Amino acid sequence: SLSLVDASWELVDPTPDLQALFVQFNDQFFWGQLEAVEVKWSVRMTLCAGICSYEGGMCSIRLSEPLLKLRPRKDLVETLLHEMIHAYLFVTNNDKDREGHGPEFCKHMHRINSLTGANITVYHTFHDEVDEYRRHWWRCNGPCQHRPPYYGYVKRATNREPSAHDYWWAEHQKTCGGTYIKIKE
Numbered sequence: 043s044l045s046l047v048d049a050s051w052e053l054v055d056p057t058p059d060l061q062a063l064f065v066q067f068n069d070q071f072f073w074g075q076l077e078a079v080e081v082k083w084s085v086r087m088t089l090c091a092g093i094c095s096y097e098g099g100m101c102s103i104r105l106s107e108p109l110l111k112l113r114p115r116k117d118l119v120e121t122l123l124h125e126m127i128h129a130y131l132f133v134t135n136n137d138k139d140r141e142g143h144g145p146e147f148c149k150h151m152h153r154i155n156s157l158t159g160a161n162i163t164v165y166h167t168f169h170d171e172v173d174e175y176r177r178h179w180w181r182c183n184g185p186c187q188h189r190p191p192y193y194g195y196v197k198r199a200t201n202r203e204p205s206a207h208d209y210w211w212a213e214h215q216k217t218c219g220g221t222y223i224k225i226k227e
């Protein structure tokens with residue numbers, strides 16, 4: 043069975059094996075196609091539970107140890123599978139939907155949920171979180187997408203774009219110099 047909803051889905055895993063999960067899911071759900079993709083824990087990241095970075099090539103996934111270590115297994119697994127769908131669309135040159143999570147995303151999302159009983163979702167909060175999260179997102183198109191601890195992200199409560207108004211702006215200009223493309227609000 044490919045079912046993931048077992049006894050232990052709603053419970054914290056003190057010793058997750060992220061590499062093993064990746065290998066398993068590449069084989070079971072992505073037809074082996076994610077060979078070039080790598081997956082790492084971050085002990086530093088907090089703006090996102092999960093991210094991808096694409097060299098535009100090699101694809102990287104990062105999972106937030108701060109946000110996931112104490113959460114139920116299901117949240118690690120659903121976050122990882124969400125990121126692997128983005129990775130798959132990148133690897134297969136099928137990431138041309140206008141939306142972040144357009145029809146292509148929902149096909150894999152819906153399909154993997156069918157196979158496993160999981161609930162991968164198009165939103166990037168946890169199912170139990172309330173509505174007190176920042177909705178306006180930018181991502182830098184410079185090298186800092188790969189750079190810890192923000193991976194290019196800026197998440198704000200209003201449409202307040204990254205600018206010289208920001209205390210960190212001059213630094214980012216020197217250390218990256220990329221431009222902040224609007225994504226969430």
Ligand SMILES: Nc1ncnc2c1ncn2[C@@H]1O[C@H](COP(=O)(O)OP(=O)(O)O)[C@@H](O)[C@H]1O
Nearest residue numbers: 089186192194195196197198210211213214217
């Ligand atoms: N040097 C940096 N380069 C790029 N982004 C940075 C840098 N320093 C901070 N940031 C951005 O600023 C955020 C921290 O801002 P914060 O101090 O929480 O104020 P705000 O209320 O504007 O979010 C980070 O999450 C990241 O998006």
Ligand SMILES: [Zn+2]
Nearest residue numbers: 124128143166
């Ligand atoms: Zn996503």
Ligand SMILES: [Zn+2]
Nearest residue numbers: 182186218220
């Ligand atoms: Zn940048």
